[PDB]
Symmetry: none
């Protein structure tokens, strides 16, 4: 028994239409909702610092619905050749934060209005070259 962050399980459907689960660290807030404190790698329509309602099933906390979006954006990237240096620089310039899953998959958090024509244009240019592919997993405020 050691001190740990609370853990949220998000059920989602993968690219093969099969059920999958992603676990995210965060905090159970005084109102009983959950503050997400990791950048989601796979679950859709969620971002770092979103506040979500939960359903408890014994020892597990499951995502139920979004209560308050942080306004952050989540971009997933698969690297097909190499990660371009100017893309890394642009992520940093726009206050982005990277979470890696191995060397060739990453999720990037952008604060409100930091993902816009600048980053979308660079990502599109590298898709055209088949250097990477990206998903707009979460686009911020609905």
């Amino acid at each position: 028994h050691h001190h740990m962050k609370s853990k949220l399980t998000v059920v989602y459907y993968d690219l093969e239409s099969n059920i999958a689960e992603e676990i995210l660290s965060g905090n159970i807030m005084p109102d009983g909702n959950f503050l997400i404190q990791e950048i989601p790698l796979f679950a859709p329509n969620l971002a770092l610092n979103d506040i979500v309602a939960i359903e408890r099933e014994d020892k597990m906390l499951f995502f139920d619905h979004l209560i308050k979006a942080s306004g952050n954006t989540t971009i997933n990237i698969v690297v097909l050749d190499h990660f371009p240096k100017d893309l890394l620089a642009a992520i940093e310039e726009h206050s982005g934060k990277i979470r890696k899953n191995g060397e060739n998959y990453l999720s990037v958090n952008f604060p409100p209005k930091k993902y816009n024509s600048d980053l979308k244009g660079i990502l599109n240019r590298y898709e055209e070259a088949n250097i990477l592919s990206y998903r707009e997993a979460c686009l911020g405020f609905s």
Copy 2:
């Protein structure tokens, strides 16, 4: 004149050690007026932390735990382990570079270097002793 009570405190940092096993290190410090925690010891083992870093904390089971970094001090933390003795020229270089040391027994030190003091000259001495199998070192926290 009498001693006045101050907001001294202790924090537990939960971390994974060099073998990827869960571990805990307690650090002494001072509560700050904003509720954050000023670390006032050189961390011996926990990574990514330095003397005089300011960190956010969480309370659980009547104890305080590290949660996340608020403001890095810019200090660097270097862990050094030796076979049997710390060479005199290494100790002198640490001192010349304004380093402060904390012992864990006779063969282990964690060293704080102020901004810009952990440099290639210091690393060169560490590297020469590493090549001779007399010590190993780790960049636990790279500052400014």
